[PDB]
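Example complex used in Figure S2.
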Amino acid sequence: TQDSNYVRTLRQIELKKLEKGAKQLMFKSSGNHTIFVDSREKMNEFTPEKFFNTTSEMVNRSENRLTKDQLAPKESLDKKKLKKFKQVKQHLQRETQLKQVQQRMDAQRELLKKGSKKKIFKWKKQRKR
Amino acid sequence: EMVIEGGKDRSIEGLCWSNVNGESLRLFSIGGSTVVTEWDLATGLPLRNYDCNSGVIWSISINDSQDKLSVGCDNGTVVLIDISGGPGVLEHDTILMRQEARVLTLAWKKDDFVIGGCSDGRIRIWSAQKNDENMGRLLHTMKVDKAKKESTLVWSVIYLPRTDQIASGDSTGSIKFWDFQFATLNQSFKAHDADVLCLTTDTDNNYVFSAGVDRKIFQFSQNTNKSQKNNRWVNSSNRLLHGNDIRAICAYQSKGADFLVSGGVEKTLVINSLTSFSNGNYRKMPTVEPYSKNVLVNKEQRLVVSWSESTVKIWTMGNYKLVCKLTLKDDQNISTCSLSPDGQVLVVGRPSTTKVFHLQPVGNKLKVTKLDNDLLLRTSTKLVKFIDNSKIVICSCEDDVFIVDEVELLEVTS
Amino acid sequence: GGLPVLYAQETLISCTEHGCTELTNVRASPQVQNKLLLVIGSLEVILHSVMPIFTFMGPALIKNSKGNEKEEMHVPRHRRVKLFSTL
Amino acid sequence: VVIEPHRHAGVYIARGKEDLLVTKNMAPGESVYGEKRISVVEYRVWNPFRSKLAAGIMGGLDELFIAPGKKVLYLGAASGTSVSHVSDVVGPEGVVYAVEFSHRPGRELISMAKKRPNIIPIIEDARHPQKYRMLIGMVDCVFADVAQPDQARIIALNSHMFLKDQGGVVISIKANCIDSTVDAETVFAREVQKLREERIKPLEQLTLEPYERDHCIVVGRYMR
Amino acid sequence: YVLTETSAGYALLKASDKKIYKSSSLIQDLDSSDKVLKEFKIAAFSKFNSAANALEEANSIIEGKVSSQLEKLLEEIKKDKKSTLIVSETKLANAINKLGLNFNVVSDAVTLDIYRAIKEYLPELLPGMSDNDLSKMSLGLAHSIGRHKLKF
Amino acid sequence: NPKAFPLADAALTQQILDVVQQAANLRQLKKGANEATKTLNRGISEFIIMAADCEPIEILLHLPLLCEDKNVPYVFVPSRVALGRACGVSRPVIAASITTNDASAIKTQIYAVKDKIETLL
Amino acid sequence: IKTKKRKTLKNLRKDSVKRGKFRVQLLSTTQDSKTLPPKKESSIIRSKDRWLNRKALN
Amino acid sequence: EGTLTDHERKYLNKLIKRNSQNLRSWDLEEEVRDELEDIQQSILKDTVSTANTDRSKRRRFKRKQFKEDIKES
Amino acid sequence: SLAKSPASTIQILGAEKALFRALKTKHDTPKYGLLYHASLVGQATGKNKGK
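Predicted assembly (1309 residues):
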């Protein structure tokens, strides 16, 4: 029905909306961490979480890990956070779908320009004068 | 005369000298990894260890007039290092244009052009000259002939200044003589039978001596006047000299001395007369000329101590019995290791940390008991020689002399 | 200035005239002579009272070390003179 | 909608409808590269994805030397976008010394440091502290984001000409700009050997994985 | 004695410390001054701050970033004619340019240590200007001739 | 040509011009400077090749700035008539972007060229 | 009496392993790696020695 | 400096436990943090596609293994 | 940030609202925009001002 000329602008609208929605989203850090210590008595007893001078329960989080001197509306947060992540993922599948639609429609428009063509889709190598 | 030994798990696959006119001769060597180690020539200590910024180092080439230095890394880079300001000084100057080949060998032409053979097959020619618009850029990628069943990779390349050429040796034996300007192949030889690993020349380039992994060292010549009118090389003479390999070669000339020195994976050192290679009386060196000795004996208990690298082994006579074997892990690069005039006190030397044990012979095995001598453990020792049965003398790595269990000497003019 | 550095070096060599010093000081040489007088008192009672009466009329380390020398050092009259010259 | 403080004095986390890292304002009323503002006093968010210090922070350091009264040098100052939030967490009585060689981003640095009087920008190269001397004295931390491969020589020369003792060195190294084709942990081991040879006592390192690929932050104290 | 030409505020300023030459600079961090010992040892000699103007800022910028033959630097140099002794500079090029008229310039590897020691405790004692005044005058010079001589 | 930052060598120029020939065979590139900036803004370009042979070089070096913003690889080539004859157009083009298609038949040589371009910064 | 010796030698000579979530590497004495600077990069010098003991030559 | 730890230990432990429970209750849910982590993982894997860079570094490492392995093709 | 823009958007830089409503419905996008008040597209006559 519509066009490459329509679907391109729609996809650009949605791509910019997606990137400045991910600009406000926040992801969890991961991967590793490594502390450098002088050789013995830190290999004998390993370094615990208490190198950080924090509590023992609040060390698994990669975010804010409040120490002791700095350390001394129930379902709505989680349902809106999961709905926002669902909305960004729905934006992303809309991006992929509009991308493949513009892909096939642009190929179908490009197939009728010119060229000594043959279905194998390749062109006869002669430069467009 | 002088040995500078590094201990367990360290190599050297490249080194070069620097002698500017009026100052100290210095060695820049590599290890296995990413550091140009500038050694002293005073007391066997690396006075500077420049971690080069890129890759893993593969070959050094000093520049003419000895102010610049080229290393070839493994990511693809060739790094220029400026060395000016006497000893101790090393600064990164520039890295030249990257590529995707493990750069294997380098050689300067003048202070301008660095020729580098790389592990794709190609030898490339970077330019690096001050006050000129193409600095850091290459000029040509001349390409050696490949082979289908094997990745051909050029192992060495040198510059020939009289006939303005570059000689390349590679991993098919194809020693190829390329022209420098116009950047293409003057002539070729499939002389060798396996990997060519090194080559050299003399001071006015009438000869090119190549030597590879099938140990056949042969000499291409340009001696006759019509051959230098054509500036074309012949496959003049051949010589087999070795048992297993060659892995390096060098040449030297003077008006009283002219000879070639080669060596390989059998551990010797073979010397030929340079300008008379077909005529010359060659000479094999012995595999050990131990002018820093490695095995000591003593006449109490009739025992022999034999210290290998970071490891000592003690036995005694009578047949015999291989009594004990000590290995040391804090001691890495071994040195002189002398025993008492009694089967008690053994001092083992290392120029960083040197130790003393005493020995309880319980019969068919020994018992070794370390004793803490901390002034000894913090000084640096070249010779330990056991004046009396308890006290010893020590030389220093700083030209002092002390007594363990103080001494002065007179100075000497420079 | 050089004589002040000489006085500080001599005091450090001993540890290893105050009225005339304050008079010629008030008559960066002032701060150097004050720090020298403080070091000389650190490493002398009536001269110290005259030096307090002179030095109150006039840096940071010299004042802190003068406080240290004063706490090392009737007493109501000296404290009254010091506080009245400060206020 | 609720502001909650972080480990370091100057950086907070906005909780509420969504959780995200955030920092305060020195120049009120305006964003500087297009990011969101949250006014509950105004604050400006700063994402881990186009910064490197921010992704290091959300990875979680241990003793970060970025201080709200002390002076911080930024070398390898990109076109705004990190020095703004470093300026915000340093605050008014401190100062941030941005320095950047390539002077196509120099226009962005000059125009942004005109708006906030807490940055001072320097346009000379990161290799010549003799050149951009005369204007800096005794900073209290240095933070590098230099992409040139001699990162250790650069931060070493700038630190021991400029950084005082027990001053923090924090660096964002990237694997591929110094040594490609060899893995990340190997090149970080090589870089920290170069650092310990240059006696910056390295406290801690992390690789900041899911925000930005194949980098590392190395923190440490300087021990002269 | 001491001859160290610290260019910090708006032009040159000579350091009149209470120590000796580059050998005492090799003993300086050995003493590990770092404190009120340094704050009492160092003292001012002469600070040739012409103005906070753009012209004086650009002239001192050309001095401290090129061949240091500025008129203010030469005028502060021609104010110690009692020995024509050895001075301690920072940059190699400025040291070589200062070693062209009746002196002995030097700059080697402990000059940076004494320069660290005087950049820490510079604005307390030597110029007399307040620390915020220097922290803003540095911003002024940085935006003025840190930009416009190098950026276009 | 001092503002012409990285320009390729002889062999790298030859291999990228053969891969741009195969790209023009398979119709997987967009040619011209304004078309290059269009496809760079809409974010499809694998890499950019640009010819340092035009009388201003500033007719093309505006796309390096957003190319550095979008981290795409980019490289110069010393001949615009070579770009034209290799791209398959009778006029001398300036710039050419290669668009992204993971289901190609030249994907591996495009990616090897892309690594050889992003290695020299 | 068979492998406990080399097991305790390994567990004293190795660098430390990941406690909790993250890992900890040690830091050697600076008065060891000051007289013999590198460690030989085994993963590439085994490559050069493998090429020189290639099976194609004999 | 004193750390009396008689009433101070109990007060500090109770205050630290209450504040740590408050800061841990500020987070969403330990059970529902399995779906949000999967959505974040998919969004990251389709936004910041570093798998192409990883495969490119794998090719750049495979192209320099000196090929004593036959290149027969 | 005007130089970093193609020739097509330098053409249609003005009349973007007619552009976007013509894109999101089915019409034909405009051709002059803000350059229409220049001195040369007024010199041309017909659809020659479009070209």
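The domain at 1-121 of chain F is CATH 3.30.1330.30 (60s Ribosomal Protein L30; Chain: A;). The first strand of chain F starts at residue 29 and ends at 31.
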